[PDB]
């Protein structure tokens, strides 16, 4: 019951390459991503108002 | 009556290649 006591947190958030491309030394391995089998009409637990 | 889940268990959309492939001529 104390948010400060957990030990962790997991978000799920859309993101597009220029965003990764932002900060470029921060990301790594960029090019292995696939973008088409991460997607939100494949994944069904991210809730979101994108059609 | 019965607790539905208000899931939609949906099929995606299959890929294309070949039309990526074609370029466009307008008319």
Request: hydrophobic share 20%; aromatic share 14%; net charge positive.
């Given at each position: 019951g104390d948010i400060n006591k957990a030990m962790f947190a997991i978000v799920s958030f859309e993101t597009c390459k220029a965003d990764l491309l932002?900060?470029?030394?921060?990301?790594?391995?960029?090019?292995?991503?696939?973008?088409q089998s991460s997607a939100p009409v494949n994944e069904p637990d991210h809730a979101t108002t994108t059609p | 009556t019965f607790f539905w889940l208000k899931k939609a268990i949906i099929t995606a959309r299959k890929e294309q290649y070949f039309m990526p492939l074609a370029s466009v001529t307008n008319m």
């Open positions: 932002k900060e470029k030394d921060r990301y790594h391995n960029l090019n292995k991503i696939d973008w | -």
